[PDB]
Amino acid sequence: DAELLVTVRGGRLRGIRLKTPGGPVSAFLGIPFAEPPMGPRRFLPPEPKQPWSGVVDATTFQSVCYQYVDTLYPGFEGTEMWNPNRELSEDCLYLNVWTPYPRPTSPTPVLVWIYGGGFYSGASSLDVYDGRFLVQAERTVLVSMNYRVGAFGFLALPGSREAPGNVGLLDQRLALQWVQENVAAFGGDPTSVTLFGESAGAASVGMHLLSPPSRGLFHRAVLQSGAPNGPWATVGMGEARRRATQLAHLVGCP
Amino acid sequence: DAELLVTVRGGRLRGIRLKTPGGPVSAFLGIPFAEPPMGPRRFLPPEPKQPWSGVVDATTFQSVCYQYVDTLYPGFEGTEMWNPNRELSEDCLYLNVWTPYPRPTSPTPVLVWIYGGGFYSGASSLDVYDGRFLVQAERTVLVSMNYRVGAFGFLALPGSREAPGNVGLLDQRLALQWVQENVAAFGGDPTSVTLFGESAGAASVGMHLLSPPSRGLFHRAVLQSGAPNGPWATVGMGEARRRATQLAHLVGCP
Amino acid sequence: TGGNDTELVACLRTRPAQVLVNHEWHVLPQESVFRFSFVPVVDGDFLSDTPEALINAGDFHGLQVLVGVVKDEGSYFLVYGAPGFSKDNESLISRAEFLAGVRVGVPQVSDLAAEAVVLHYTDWLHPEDPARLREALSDVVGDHNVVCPVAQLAGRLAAQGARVYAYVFEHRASTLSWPLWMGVPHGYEIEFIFGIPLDPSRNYTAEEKIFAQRLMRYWANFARTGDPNEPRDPKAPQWPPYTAGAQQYVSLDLRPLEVRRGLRAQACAFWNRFLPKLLSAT
Amino acid sequence: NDTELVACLRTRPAQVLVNHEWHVLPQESVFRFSFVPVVDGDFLSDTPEALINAGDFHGLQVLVGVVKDEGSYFLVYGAPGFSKDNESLISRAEFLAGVRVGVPQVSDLAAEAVVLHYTDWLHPEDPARLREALSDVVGDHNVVCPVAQLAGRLAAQGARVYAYVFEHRASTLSWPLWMGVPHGYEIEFIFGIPLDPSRNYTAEEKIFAQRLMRYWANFARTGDPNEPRDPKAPQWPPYTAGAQQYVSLDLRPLEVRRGLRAQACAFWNRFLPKLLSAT
Ligand SMILES: *[C@@H]1O[C@H](CO[C@@H]2O[C@@H](C)[C@@H](O)[C@@H](O)[C@@H]2O)[C@@H](O[C@@H]2O[C@H](CO)[C@@H](O[C@@H]3O[C@H](CO)[C@@H](O)[C@H](O)[C@@H]3O)[C@H](O)[C@H]2NC(C)=O)[C@H](O)[C@H]1NC(C)=O
Ligand SMILES: CC(=O)N[C@@H]1[C@@H](O)[C@H](O[C@@H]2O[C@H](CO)[C@H](O)[C@H](O[C@]3(C(=O)O)C[C@H](O)[C@@H](NC(C)=O)[C@H]([C@H](O)[C@H](O)CO)O3)[C@H]2O)[C@@H](CO)O[C@H]1O
Ligand SMILES: *[C@@H]1O[C@H](CO[C@@H]2O[C@@H](C)[C@@H](O)[C@@H](O)[C@@H]2O)[C@@H](O[C@@H]2O[C@H](CO)[C@@H](O)[C@H](O)[C@H]2NC(C)=O)[C@H](O)[C@H]1NC(C)=O
Ligand SMILES: OC[C@H]1O[C@@H](OCCCCc2cn(CCCc3ccc(O)c(/C=N\O)n3)nn2)[C@H](O)[C@@H](O)[C@@H]1O
Ligand SMILES: [Cl-]
Ligand SMILES: [Cl-]
Ligand SMILES: [Cl-]
Ligand SMILES: [Cl-]
Ligand SMILES: [Cl-]
Ligand SMILES: [Cl-]
Ligand SMILES: [Cl-]
Ligand SMILES: [Cl-]
Ligand SMILES: [Cl-]
Ligand SMILES: [Cl-]
Ligand SMILES: [Cl-]
Ligand SMILES: [Cl-]
Ligand SMILES: [Cl-]
Ligand SMILES: [Cl-]
Ligand SMILES: [Cl-]
Ligand SMILES: [Cl-]
Ligand SMILES: [Cl-]
Ligand SMILES: [Cl-]
Ligand SMILES: [Cl-]
Ligand SMILES: [Cl-]
Ligand SMILES: [Cl-]
Ligand SMILES: [Cl-]
Ligand SMILES: [Mg+2]
Ligand SMILES: [Mg+2]
Ligand SMILES: [Mg+2]
Ligand SMILES: [Mg+2]
């Protein structure tokens, strides 16, 4: 009851008690970590969420970044489990934190999940990514983030300050910067954070490993079923420009 | 015993009886099927042996065509079993006939052996190629021949009437023509000849399947570990000059 | 002020988000499966250079890494574009469908380079068995896009100072809704690493809960110590580190851990070593 | 000049020609020989590979086969680090070198393709595998695959083709055990040499050689090696280009195997010539 009220660097939060067969777990869902990347800020690197008055309602998952919704086999569990379970929004840069119900007295190692989805889809809120059983069982802290996908994350006109590429990764980094500054208010240990991610989530992990500004924000890395060096996970500059120019032609942008 | 004096189209022959654990066969070894290819006839296609008065001694093997002699492992059985077991001479165009001791009273198919060893070596007189057991156990006629090898049967200056190339193959062909004319003198059926060969000999058999003028001289073919198409059994006319003119230069010619 | 790049983007910002999404798939260069149109870019900023080049020249002393693939990485992708493939039948494709399927799984590649894929991946005694061909294409896609990339990364971190552990996840969920020919498809370890079988509502088997609890413990262990193994428990089967030479991984399924050797070594030699030389010399 | 050049060769003694014969070979090699049949347009109107796919082969019975280890014999004549007197446990460096001498006259990229398929990428450095591997390279490139090309093209154009693999080691065999069944050591048995009481062959080998002489004699009589009517034993089935059936000539009865190094010869007969004329 008092375990569900936490204050991070930019304001106060209210969480929710999650039941597990093993016992309960404290969850803080939908924590803003970036100012909404809208209007003039579409295609631009994220800005850190400025402090807020009052208590943020961290009771339930926030929105899902704008993405194509699969329609090959409609209604089919095998494809709908990967589909959005919240409203779509450009206002989606939110992260989630799970922590053991007796907030750990000693700092606890913390795992950070990056969802996959070919870099065009995905959402921290999928039921498959529920962190409560992992926290219940192993008594660690678990953090997942949303990051812009599709052209909202990765459209690039290389060389231009107006669409520079890679801002979906940059969303991920800012959330890693957030965990470093704030995970300790939930019991986490900033000096032992482990990245883990599947598919393009794994390729993302790969690239924080290869990007010096990221390699101060984590200490060990789990790649499941993907790698940054795959044929599909990066693209040349010439080719990203070619694909961005074609999208704008298809959309009527002269 | 009287079955050891036989007369072929070129004159009389005197053969030798041979011993098997199962019983005897009678053999005619070193029958001259070509005028000896030497002096001006070096590198020229073979001519048919002019006929002879008297009885040709066909009781021993004739010379082995001039060839390189393996000196890698001196005395070694595995090496030496392929090395020549008669004098070297360019005077070497002779063939051998085995036939069952009670001569078959009805036509009986003819097996014709072409020896191997990469076209630079070999001889019909090697002990491995002995025909007594085949002819005793299955009662077929066996013929083996000697053909020119190395430069003596395959140096080619394509285009010249002087080194036409393939004269070693024409040697084999002349032997097959000889089988067609005379194998009936030994109880053999000219209309049921089966070629068999190993290594370069299998390559040769194959090449007879592909030269029309040899296709009337046999009817079946067995190819043991060799084939005419492989990467080693043929060269183009331009490589044959390159290789033949280099030999001439390594020997002082021009 | 206008320039032209600034023009392009200022306009794209006026479009409703849903308008952009609906034209997303239309910018791909060829017909393809396991291609996505807006992905990270080698701009020189976030990535100093190509992820390959970074790996080759990296120093990774002080890093522990846990990597792995599922048994059938490619089966999922096939039904999203491959001629003859479907969730709803057995996908017993024809040979001509298979050859066409190879140009889609390996797009933007020369003719002779697809000959080489056909050479490596057909069974020239059964060139036309539909079942073997389904499997073959499921391997062409899964290998080229997941496994051989993962295995290149893993051997190369290991040989340059990292401490790596590898796994093949090869348990098929009792609850799985895809058809049986897909096997253990891409993405179907996650249910277990996150321990969903523990959720009473999802109708998982009692042995499967244990599998997830057991599988959670390797992940927590790795997070804590950088080593999935139990430190005080030596008498349970050790999970050895992957190295460029011995190439050991473990099998994660309901059976106790089994150590295996070589992560599709024979295939990944084609994808990671020979294919690049072939595209580069033609 | 041509007539001038040959006359001079015709005055030179015969042993000097033999002496300088191996020198004219283009590039260091193994299983290559200086003077062979030339594709002149008289005896061979085109290359054998051409002649083989548009020839007149209906009405023809052909018996073809290979021995189990075709490559071994040639490796002691040019491959680095091979002898009959040691185990030939070669290094990877020596393996790479021997590929270029076993497969001469070929591009660097093509030789990389050979190494791609005949290396064991779990055990790239194991000398025993490297040894047998290079033996297969030379065996496949030179014997097994050119024969397997001929069999299928002959069969497809209406030849009755029978295919064997000979996989028995003479107890008398003098070469080291690692050479397996080397190139040439079916001949002793086909020719009935075990029957000679001079030689020290097994009682059971004498049965074997009599059974092979029977197969070769049945073929010569009837175009079919099989024992006529006689159904006691497995039947030796003709090789078709589809099912690609051959038998194993062994001290055991006929085993009817299927597919004659299929995956290897796909590379050797089909892919490598594409790669050569494309680079
Ligand atoms: C397995 O199923 C695939 C996919 O087909 C889809 O699922 C099946 C269960 C059926 O209910 C299909 O109706 C359904 O779309 C089969 O491949 C598909 O075959 C159909 C023909 O039956 C193709 O449709 C044609 O498309 C062309 C244009 O390309 C038109 O000219 C035709 O008039 C017709 O509409 C369809 O394109 C094709 N799908 C794919 C992805 O290739 C597949 O044949 C089947 N396997 C077996 C062994 O039967
Ligand atoms: C057997 C008989 O009654 N008389 C033969 C006589 O037929 C034979 O003439 C040769 O017959 C053969 C049949 O297989 C060919 O038709 C010969 O033509 C060729 C060949 O292809 O073999 C033509 C070829 O261009 C020639 N090559 C050269 C000159 O380089 C060869 C060559 O002359 C060889 O000497 C043949 O061995 O011949 C046809 O001439 C002769 C042998 O020439 O012998 C009688 O007894
Ligand atoms: C196996 O033998 C070959 C051939 O070497 C010959 O035979 C041996 C019994 C020995 O007496 C050698 O000195 C003979 O020359 C070896 O190839 C040579 O190896 C030696 C050193 O072993 C080296 O100095 C030579 O230069 C090599 N010659 C070459 C490569 O052409 C081979 O190395 C031996 N293999 C093993 C595993 O010992
Ligand atoms: O030129 C354009 C070409 O596009 C085609 O449009 C196809 C529309 C969508 C195609 C598609 C959907 N999908 C889903 C892959 C599932 C997935 C991806 C990543 C993951 O990580 C995961 C798992 N966990 O996250 N799952 N894949 N492809 C045209 O049909 C074609 O003809 C055109 O040529
Ligand atoms: Cl306040
Ligand atoms: Cl459905
Ligand atoms: Cl930054
Ligand atoms: Cl890359
Ligand atoms: Cl010795
Ligand atoms: Cl009789
Ligand atoms: Cl030429
Ligand atoms: Cl030329
Ligand atoms: Cl088939
Ligand atoms: Cl089958
Ligand atoms: Cl270490
Ligand atoms: Cl194994
Ligand atoms: Cl493999
Ligand atoms: Cl040799
Ligand atoms: Cl080259
Ligand atoms: Cl090794
Ligand atoms: Cl081993
Ligand atoms: Cl009998
Ligand atoms: Cl088999
Ligand atoms: Cl074989
Ligand atoms: Cl094979
Ligand atoms: Cl191969
Ligand atoms: Mg030429
Ligand atoms: Mg290949
Ligand atoms: Mg050829
Ligand atoms: Mg190497």
Short mmCIF file of N, CA and C and ligand atoms in Angstrom, two decimals, chain D residues 100 106-109 279, ligand 19:
data_model
loop_
_atom_site.label_atom_id
_atom_site.label_comp_id
_atom_site.label_asym_id
_atom_site.label_seq_id
_atom_site.Cartn_x
_atom_site.Cartn_y
_atom_site.Cartn_z
N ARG D 100 45.22 -27.08 -54.57
CA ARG D 100 45.66 -26.40 -55.78
C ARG D 100 46.49 -27.30 -56.67
N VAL D 106 42.58 -23.66 -62.33
CA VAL D 106 41.27 -23.33 -61.79
C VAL D 106 41.46 -22.03 -61.02
N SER D 107 40.39 -21.25 -60.90
CA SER D 107 40.53 -19.94 -60.28
C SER D 107 40.67 -20.05 -58.76
N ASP D 108 41.20 -18.98 -58.16
CA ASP D 108 41.27 -18.91 -56.70
C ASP D 108 39.89 -19.05 -56.08
N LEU D 109 38.87 -18.42 -56.68
CA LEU D 109 37.52 -18.50 -56.13
C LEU D 109 36.98 -19.92 -56.22
N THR D 279 33.76 -16.46 -63.79
CA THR D 279 34.86 -15.70 -63.19
C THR D 279 36.17 -16.02 -63.91
CL CL E 19 42.26 -16.28 -60.28
#
